[PDB]
Amino acid sequence: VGVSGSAEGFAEGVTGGGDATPVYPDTIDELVSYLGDDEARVIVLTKTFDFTDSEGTTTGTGCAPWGTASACQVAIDQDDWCENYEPDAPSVSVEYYNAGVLGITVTSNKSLIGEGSSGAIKGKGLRIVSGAENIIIQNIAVTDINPKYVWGGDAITLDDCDLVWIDHVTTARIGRQHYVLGTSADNRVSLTNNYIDGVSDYSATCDGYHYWGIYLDGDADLVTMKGNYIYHTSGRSPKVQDNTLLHCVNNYFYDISGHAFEIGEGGYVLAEGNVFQNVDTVLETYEGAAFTVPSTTAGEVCSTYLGRDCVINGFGCSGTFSEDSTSFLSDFEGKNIASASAYTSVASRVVANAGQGNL
Template sequence: MKSASAILAVLAGLVNIAAAQAVSAKAEGYGARVTRGGSATAVTPKEIKELTTYLTDDEPRVILLDKENDYTTSEGTESGIVCASWGTGNACQKIILNTCDSQSPAKETWNKAARQPIDVGNNKTILGVGSKGAIKGKGLRMRGSNVIIQNIEVSDLNHKYVWGGDAIGFDGADLVWVDHVTTARPGRQHYVFGFNPSKRITLSNNFINGESTYSTGCNGYHYRTFEMVGKDDQITMKNNGIYKTSGRSPALSGGTLLHAV
C-alpha cells in the first residue's frame, strides 16, 4: 500500500503539470489580444529535433519545456575571420566580419546553430515547467502571429562573438507576448526587431541578464540589449529587469511606438 506521503507527492506532481499547461496571467498593452495555442493538447518534446518540429509546423500548439534543450553543437561548427575591434584582452568580444583592416584579424571557429534562429510558427504557446525550461545555443524568431513565450531561458549564443547569435527576434510579427523570460549571454542582441514592422507586441516581466564573460567594453557589461528598427513597430514593455548592460537599453528607430512602464 502506498504511503500517504507518496500519494501526496504524486498529486502535487499532477497539479504542477496541470499548472504548467496554463498561461499565467494575461498580456497587457499592445499584445493584450494574443490567444495562444488555443485548445491544443500540450506536448513535451523529448529532444531538440522534436522541439524544432513543434515550433515550426503549421499546427496550433502548447509546448512544454521541462528541461534544458541544448542546440549548441547540433549543427556543427564553421570558421571565419574575426576582428578585435574593441581590444585584445581576454574579456573583449570579437566581431565576425569578412575583413578587419588593422583590427587584429584572426581566424576562429564558432557554433553554427546560434547564427540561425528558429522561426516560430503561428499559434504557438511555449511554456517552461517550473524553473527547468531552457533553450541553449539557439534563439527564437517570430515572423508570424499569435505566439506566447513564458517562463523559459534562452542563453549562450556564441557569446564571444558579435554576430554570433540573437536570443529573441521579431521580423514582421503580430500579436506576440514574451513574459517571464530570461535571456543571457547572446553574441549580439538580447532582443532584436527587424526592418519589417512588428505589431501588437508585449514584453513583460523579463530578465535581461547582461553579465558577460566577453563584452565590447571588455568589462563584463553586455552592450547590445534591445534593437528596435522596424517601421512603426508597436511594442509594450512592462516590468522588465535589465542587469549589467552598457547600451541599447533600448535603441529606437524607424518610428517605433514604444510604451515602457
Template sequence: MHFNPSLYVVLSLLASLGSVSAVGVVGQAPGFAADTTGGGNSSPVYPKDIKELTAYLTDNSPRVIVLNKEYNYIGSEGKVSEKGCRPDSNKCPGNGGQDAINGANWCSNSKYPLSISVSYDKAGIAGIPVKSNKSLIGIGSSGIIRGKGLRIANGAKNVIIQNIHITELNPQYIWGGDAITLVNTDLIWIDHVKTSLIGRQHIVTGYEPSNRVTISNSEIDGRTSWSATCDGHHYWAILFYGTSDKVTMLGNYIHNTSGRSPKVGGTGSGTLLHAVNNYWENNSGHAFDISENAKVLAEGNAFQNVKTTLLSGREALFSVPDTGSAEACRSALGRKCELNAFGSSGAFVGTATGFLGTMKDGVSPMAASKVVASVLANAGVGKI
C-alpha cells in the first residue's frame, strides 16, 4: 500500500482535534435542566483566538463552540490601578489574604474605607455575555479559559457548558471576578466544568430568575494563595440567590473551600435546590448556609473533613438524617431518599419535608457509600 504523507497529516490533525462530525455535547442534562439542547446540531466551530471565541459566544446564532486549547484573556483589556480596601478578614501574615476591589461600592463605607492600592486585570471583572442556544465544549483537558468568566443573563437561555476549565480571575482580590454568572435565564447545564483561582464566586445565580439549572460532574477547586480565611481555602464558592430557581447539583466535587459551598436563598420564592451525590472535602469553614426563601433536599452526599456542614437554615432543609426519615420521600417522589455520609465532619440535620413534592427532577441517586469513588473518577475536565 502506497504511503501518503499528506493524508497522514490530515488524519493526525483530525485525531488530535476530534472529527468535526463526531464533536458535540456528550450525554443529556439530568435534573431540572433536562430539556437543555444548547447549540443542538449546529456545525462545530473552533475559535482561533479570544476575539473569535467572544464573537461566537455573543452572536445570535446557535453554536457548538469547541475549545481545543487555552484562551488567555489576561491583559486583553488592560490593567487597572486604583484605591481598594482591606476587610477585617485580611489579617493574614504576608500576602496570604484577600484585599478588595471596590465592586458594587463594597469598599465605600466607614467600615472598609478606600485606603489601599489595588492593581488588577480588567478582563476578569466582567464575564463574556453568552447568548442563547450555545454549546461550549472542551476537547480532552485542553479547553481552558484563563482570566475571564462567563455571564449568561438578560433573558439568554438554553446554554450548555461542558468540559472546560475557567481559571485565574484576579484571585488575590474580593470582587476580582466570577467564573460563571446566571441572571434572568433558563435551561442552563454546567457539566464537567472546573473552576479554580477565582476572585469572587465560582458559580452564582443572581437576584432575578435563573429558572432551571443543572450543575453536574463539576469541580469547584478552592485551593488558593489568597484566602479570606487565611488558610489557603477560598470562601466565596457557590451562591444561589435567584427567584423561583430550580437547581440540581449532581455528582460535583467541592473541595478546599471555607464557606458558601453553597449559600442558598433568594427573593420571592427563592431557590429550590436538590443537592444529590456530591462530595465535599476539606472545608475549613461551612458548606451549606441556607437563608430566606430557600428549600433544600440534600441526599446521598458525602462530607469529609467539613468543619461545619450547615451554618444556618435547618428549617428549610431536609437532610435525610436517619433511615426512618428516608421513607418520607416515597409519597412525594415515588422512592426513598438516600442518607448522607460523613467522615470527620459536623452535624447536618434538617427535617423539613413540606416541599419534597417540588423536588421531582427525575434524578435517581446512588447510595452515599459509592459517591466518593464515583465523583473522584468523573468530576471535572478530561473525564468525559
C-alpha cells in the first residue's frame, strides 16, 4: 500500500514521503505528530480521525449578513470582519468548535494516503504552510468543519509551499473554503480527481449550495485542475486572481446555482475539455485573462506552447463561456502540461474516478 499513480500537470515530480516505511496512526495525537514531523513520512489513514471537540468550544458575537433564516450560515467576527465588511449586518451569537478554525500543520516530504474509503479527518482541515514542500495527500476525506460558520475553518490550506499534489480527496460541509491558496507563493500545485461536495445545511445563499469553493489567491502560483468534480456550489468555483496561472482541464462542473468562475486581475485561465452541466453562470467576474478554446480551430494556437492542440469545452443547460486571450499562453513553455481528453468522456469518467474511495 502506498501512493497510487503519479502527479500530472505542474506538480509532476512530487514524491512526498518517498518510499519511507508506512506508519499507521491510532490517535489524533499520533497523526498530528507524523504530519508535523521532521522525517519523510508515509502516513496511512485507516479510519476517521475526529477532531471536532478536541479543542473545546467558543461562544461569542458574530453577524448575519446573508439573512437570519435557519438555512443561512452566519459569520464569526474574526479580525473585525463584520465591522468593516458588513457594518449593517445584525449581530448574532455564535458557538463553534475551536478545532476547525486552524488546520493541522503539514511539513515537507509527507505522503498522507487513506485506505479504501476509511481514511478521513473530521472537524479539522490540513494546512500546508511555512515553506513546506513535496507533499502528497491522496484518497482521504476532510469534512464537517463548523458548517454554519464563515471563518469557522477551511478544509485545505496551502500558504507558502511548493510541489503539492492533492488527489482523490473529498471535501464536504466546511464553514468556509474547501481549498484556499495562500497569499504567498504556492508555486507548483496539482489538484486532480478531487470531489468538492457543496451540499450543505447552511449556505451563504441560504439554499444548500456552498459558496466558498476554491480560492486561488497565491502570489506566484501554477495550478493544474484536472478530473475534479465540482458539485453543488454557488460561487468561487473557482475564484482565480493575484498571480495565478490556472490550467483547468477535464473537470466536471455540475449543479451550480449561482456562478462558477471569478477571474480577477492577475488571474490567467486556460479552460479546456471541461463539461458544465446545469451551471447558471459559468463566468461572473472577468478582470484577468482566459482562453476557453472557443472552437476546434481556435484550439490550434496552443500547439506552439503546449506542444499540442487545446480541446473545446462542453455545455449542457449552462450559461456561456467564451474568451480568447492568448497573450499568456507563452507562460506554459517549459512547464509540465497535463494531457487533455475530449469533453465527451469527462462527465462519465469524473463521477466514477473523482473523490475518496474511487481510487
